[PDB]
Amino acid sequence: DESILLLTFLGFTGLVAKYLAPAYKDFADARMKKVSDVLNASRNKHVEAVKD
Amino acid sequence: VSTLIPPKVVSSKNIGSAPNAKRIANVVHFYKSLPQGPAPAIKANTRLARYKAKYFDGDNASGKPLWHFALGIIAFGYSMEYYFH
């Protein structure tokens, strides 16, 4: 009975890995980029201040 | 008549502008700056620093650890099923 349930869970992880796992990778990547760009922007900014 | 003495006196331009504050910040920050930061996590060793390194590093977030973590709990109760049956 419960081997049917375990089969359902295997299917569940299959769908998750199919659709969600690349999506969550892309989502996480997008944010990571944004944080990095802001960080690097701040570095540029203080370099400007020295020159000023 | 005889010129005044201000042009040859400077002693408060060093608080007088905003980049002075930034300067005293970035002389400390950058002077003792490292070229690169230390670590993106690396400890979990016992032949599991590899598990973290492959799955729970900044390199990737993928469904492989999830599957692995799920399977550990499945292995516990599945064996226990036959302990109950």
CSV table of C-alpha atoms in Angstrom, one decimal:
chain,number,residue,atom,x,y,z
A,1,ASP,CA,0.0,0.0,0.0
A,2,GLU,CA,2.7,2.4,1.2
A,3,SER,CA,5.0,1.5,-1.7
A,4,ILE,CA,2.4,3.3,-3.9
A,5,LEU,CA,2.9,6.3,-1.6
A,6,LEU,CA,6.7,6.1,-1.8
A,7,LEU,CA,6.2,5.9,-5.6
A,8,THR,CA,4.1,9.1,-5.4
A,9,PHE,CA,7.0,10.8,-3.5
A,10,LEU,CA,9.5,9.7,-6.1
A,11,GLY,CA,7.3,11.3,-8.7
A,12,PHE,CA,7.0,14.4,-6.5
A,13,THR,CA,10.7,14.8,-6.3
A,14,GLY,CA,10.9,14.2,-10.1
A,15,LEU,CA,8.5,17.0,-10.9
A,16,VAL,CA,10.3,19.3,-8.4
A,17,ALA,CA,13.7,18.6,-10.0
A,18,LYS,CA,12.2,19.1,-13.4
A,19,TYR,CA,10.6,22.5,-13.0
A,20,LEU,CA,11.5,24.0,-9.7
A,21,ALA,CA,15.1,23.2,-9.2
A,22,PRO,CA,16.3,25.1,-12.4
A,23,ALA,CA,13.9,27.9,-11.6
A,24,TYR,CA,15.2,28.2,-8.0
A,25,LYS,CA,18.7,28.2,-9.4
A,26,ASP,CA,17.9,31.0,-11.8
A,27,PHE,CA,16.0,33.0,-9.1
A,28,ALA,CA,18.9,32.6,-6.6
A,29,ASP,CA,21.4,33.6,-9.3
A,30,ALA,CA,19.5,36.7,-10.2
A,31,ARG,CA,19.5,38.0,-6.6
A,32,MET,CA,23.2,37.0,-6.2
A,33,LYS,CA,24.1,39.1,-9.2
A,34,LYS,CA,22.2,42.1,-7.8
A,35,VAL,CA,23.9,41.9,-4.4
A,36,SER,CA,27.3,41.7,-6.1
A,37,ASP,CA,26.6,44.6,-8.4
A,38,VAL,CA,25.6,46.9,-5.5
A,39,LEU,CA,28.7,45.7,-3.5
A,40,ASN,CA,31.0,46.4,-6.4
A,41,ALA,CA,29.3,49.8,-7.0
A,42,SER,CA,30.1,50.8,-3.4
A,43,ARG,CA,33.8,49.9,-4.1
A,44,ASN,CA,33.8,52.2,-7.1
A,45,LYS,CA,32.2,54.9,-5.1
A,46,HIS,CA,34.9,55.1,-2.4
A,47,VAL,CA,37.5,55.1,-5.1
A,48,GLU,CA,35.8,58.2,-6.5
A,49,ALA,CA,35.9,59.9,-3.0
A,50,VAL,CA,39.7,59.5,-2.7
A,51,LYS,CA,40.1,61.2,-6.0
A,52,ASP,CA,37.6,64.0,-5.1
B,1,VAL,CA,47.4,98.0,1.3
B,2,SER,CA,48.9,94.9,2.9
B,3,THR,CA,47.3,91.6,2.1
B,4,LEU,CA,45.6,89.6,4.8
B,5,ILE,CA,47.0,86.3,6.1
B,6,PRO,CA,44.1,83.7,5.4
B,7,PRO,CA,45.4,82.2,2.0
B,8,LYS,CA,48.4,80.8,3.7
B,9,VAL,CA,46.5,79.3,6.6
B,10,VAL,CA,44.8,75.9,6.2
B,11,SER,CA,43.9,73.6,9.1
B,12,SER,CA,40.2,72.8,8.9
B,13,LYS,CA,39.7,71.6,5.3
B,14,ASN,CA,40.3,68.2,6.8
B,15,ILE,CA,37.0,68.2,8.6
B,16,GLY,CA,35.6,70.7,6.1
B,17,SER,CA,34.5,68.3,3.5
B,18,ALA,CA,32.6,65.0,3.4
B,19,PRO,CA,35.4,62.7,1.8
B,20,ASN,CA,37.4,63.3,5.0
B,21,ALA,CA,35.0,61.0,6.8
B,22,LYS,CA,35.3,58.4,4.0
B,23,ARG,CA,39.0,58.8,3.9
B,24,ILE,CA,39.5,57.9,7.6
B,25,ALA,CA,37.2,55.0,6.9
B,26,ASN,CA,39.0,53.7,3.9
B,27,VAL,CA,42.5,54.2,5.3
B,28,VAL,CA,41.6,51.6,7.8
B,29,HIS,CA,39.5,49.4,5.5
B,30,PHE,CA,41.9,49.7,2.7
B,31,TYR,CA,45.4,49.4,4.0
B,32,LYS,CA,44.4,46.3,6.0
B,33,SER,CA,42.3,45.0,3.2
B,34,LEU,CA,42.9,41.4,2.0
B,35,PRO,CA,43.0,40.8,-1.8
B,36,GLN,CA,40.2,38.3,-1.4
B,37,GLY,CA,37.8,37.3,1.4
B,38,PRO,CA,38.4,34.1,3.5
B,39,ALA,CA,35.6,31.4,2.9
B,40,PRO,CA,32.2,30.5,1.5
B,41,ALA,CA,31.9,27.7,4.1
B,42,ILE,CA,34.0,24.5,4.0
B,43,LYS,CA,33.6,22.7,7.3
B,44,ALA,CA,31.4,19.6,7.7
B,45,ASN,CA,34.4,17.1,7.4
B,46,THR,CA,34.0,13.4,8.1
B,47,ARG,CA,33.6,12.5,4.3
B,48,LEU,CA,30.8,15.0,4.5
B,49,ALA,CA,32.8,18.2,3.8
B,50,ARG,CA,32.6,16.8,0.3
B,51,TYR,CA,28.8,16.5,0.7
B,52,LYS,CA,28.6,20.2,1.6
B,53,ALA,CA,31.2,21.1,-1.0
B,54,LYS,CA,29.3,19.5,-3.8
B,55,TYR,CA,25.8,20.5,-2.8
B,56,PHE,CA,25.7,23.3,-0.2
B,57,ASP,CA,28.4,25.6,-1.6
B,58,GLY,CA,27.8,28.7,-3.6
B,59,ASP,CA,28.7,26.6,-6.6
B,60,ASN,CA,25.2,25.3,-6.9
B,61,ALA,CA,21.8,24.9,-5.2
B,62,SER,CA,20.3,21.9,-6.9
B,63,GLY,CA,17.9,19.2,-5.8
B,64,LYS,CA,20.6,16.5,-5.1
B,65,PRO,CA,21.1,17.2,-1.4
B,66,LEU,CA,17.3,17.4,-1.0
B,67,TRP,CA,17.0,13.9,-2.5
B,68,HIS,CA,19.8,12.7,-0.3
B,69,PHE,CA,18.4,14.2,2.9
B,70,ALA,CA,14.9,12.8,2.1
B,71,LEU,CA,16.3,9.4,1.5
B,72,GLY,CA,18.0,9.3,5.0
B,73,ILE,CA,14.6,9.7,6.7
B,74,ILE,CA,13.0,7.2,4.3
B,75,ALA,CA,15.7,4.6,5.2
B,76,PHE,CA,15.0,5.0,8.9
B,77,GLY,CA,11.3,4.5,8.8
B,78,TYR,CA,11.4,1.9,5.9
B,79,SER,CA,13.7,-0.4,8.0
B,80,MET,CA,11.5,0.3,11.0
B,81,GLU,CA,8.4,-0.7,9.0
B,82,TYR,CA,9.8,-4.3,9.0
B,83,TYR,CA,10.6,-3.8,12.7
B,84,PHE,CA,6.8,-3.0,13.1
B,85,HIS,CA,5.6,-5.6,10.6
